[PDB]
Amino acid sequence: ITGTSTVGVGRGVLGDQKNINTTYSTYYYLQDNTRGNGIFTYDAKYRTTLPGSLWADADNQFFASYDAPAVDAHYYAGVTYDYYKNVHNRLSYDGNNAAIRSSVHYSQGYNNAFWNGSQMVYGDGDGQTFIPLSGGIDVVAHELTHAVTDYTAGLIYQNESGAINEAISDIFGTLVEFYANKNPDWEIGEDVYTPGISGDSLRSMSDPAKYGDPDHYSKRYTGTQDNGGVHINSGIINKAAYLISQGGTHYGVSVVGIGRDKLGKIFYRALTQYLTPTSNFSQLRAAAVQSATDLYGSTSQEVASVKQAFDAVGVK
């Protein structure tokens, strides 16, 4: 909508106060004009028609319970925008400042969030398995990273290309979580998963097996479920990414860690210059070795570390 840029204030899903960029025209809308061609947040009003209505508020204060998921979808989309722009010089998901649209309150008791090819969609959870999923910065950034992948490598969402797609989203989800630097970890979705159980999460990158996901290629899932295990076999690549950043000895293979920033630069370059829609895990290894070579040189610690990490998860 046409109006003037304003700054609202409210509380997110975990009860934290934050400022949000809004737009005023009779109502205050969740429309942030300060980033690209805008960030826009919508109310799906517990139904599944999308996007719903652009979020409108009478006084620019967003402290109602109903407001909380919108506050966080909107704010965390901005954080994710800032990460890609500042860290990778990428302007929005298409690289040309496409408008970022999100809908909250999707359906009833919906225990998921997703990128639908055009926009972000967040359920509220059923209050047992999940609370509203935009409360999780890693979840927001995971999903927005799907848009980045769709516009770049275009990894097909099934079998190994699909598991890479998923791991890419968990990797940048986590790097965005560290960027924001509020309780960062290598787990996924811990802020919104199972409110009555502390200490758990949906997936772990540091030890995927904690939740029964494979952490070596020899344990890959090869059935038909979950698009051929895209959220399962992602653990093999997640573990590799973890090891590249943090180091460790895994099934007796030692990896020298090189830290999060180099992890991000190597995987961003692989994603944007080397991976293709049908890439498999071995091709991912090749893409990551070549990206590290480009960035740090053939004889670098960084290239050897990428090799060690893929060796450790059994991907040659």
- Annotated binding residues for Zn(2+): 142, 146, 166
Residue 138 contact partner, candidates Ca ion, Zn ion, none, CB within 5 to 8 A by sort of partner: Ca ion
Residue 84 contact partner, candidates Zn ion, Ca ion, none, CB within 5 to 8 A by sort of partner: none
**Residue 197 sits in the site that holds Ca ion (CB under 5 A):** yes
Q: Taking the complex as a whole, how short is the minimal distance between the CB of residue 252 and Ca ion, in angstroms?
A: 28
**Residue 233 sits in the site that holds Zn ion (CB under 5 A):** no
Site string for Ca ion, 111-140 (x = CB under 5 A): ---------------------------x--
Backbone dihedral angles phi then psi of residue 45, each to the nearest 5 degrees: 55, 40
**Residue 57 sits in the site that holds Ca ion (CB under 5 A):** yes
Site string for Zn ion, 155-184 (x = CB under 5 A): --------------x---------------
**Residue 238 sits in the site that holds Zn ion (CB under 5 A):** no
Please give the helix or strand (H or E) that residue 245 lies within, else none. helix 234-246
**Residue 308 sits in the site that holds Zn ion (CB under 5 A):** no
> Nearer to Ca ion by C-beta: 135 or 314?
135
Q: Do the Cβ atoms of 248 and 257 come closer than 8 Å?
A: yes
Instruction: Identify which range of 52-60, 120-128, 213-221, 302-310 contacts Ca ion by CB under 5 A.
Output: 52-60
Q: Do the Cβ atoms of 34 and 5 come closer than 8 Å?
A: yes
Query: Which residue in 209, 213, 216, 217 sits closest to 226, CA to CA?
Result: 213
**At which residue do the structure tokens 């972000």 appear?**
120
CA distances from 15 to 29, 32, 68, 130 (A): 21, 21, 8, 16
Q: Do the Cβ atoms of 1 and 31 come closer than 8 Å?
A: yes
Instruction: Give the number of C-alpha atoms closer than 13 A to the C-alpha of residue 237, restricted to the C-beta side.
Output: 31
Long-range contacts of 283-286 (CB under 8 A, 24+ apart): 284/164, 284/237, 284/315, 285/310, 285/315, 285/316
Q: Does the active-site annotation cover 143?
A: yes
Q: Does the active-site annotation cover 231?
A: yes
Q: Taking the complex as a whole, how short is the minimal distance between the CB of residue 141 and Ca ion, in angstroms?
A: 10
Query: What's the residue count for the chain?
Result: 316
> Nearer to Ca ion by C-beta: 180 or 306?
180
Residue 213 contact partner, candidates Ca ion, Zn ion, none, CB within 5 to 8 A by sort of partner: none
Q: Taking the complex as a whole, how short is the minimal distance between the CB of residue 234 and Zn ion, in angstroms?
A: 8
Q: According to CB under 5 A, which one of 94, 185, 226, 294 is a site residue for Ca ion?
A: 185
Is residue 193 exposed (0-12), middle (13-18) or buried (19+ Cβ within 10 Å)? buried
- Rounded distance, CA 95 to CA 155, Å? 17
Q: Taking the complex as a whole, how short is the minimal distance between the CB of residue 187 and Ca ion, in angstroms?
A: 5
Residues that are catalytic: 143, 231
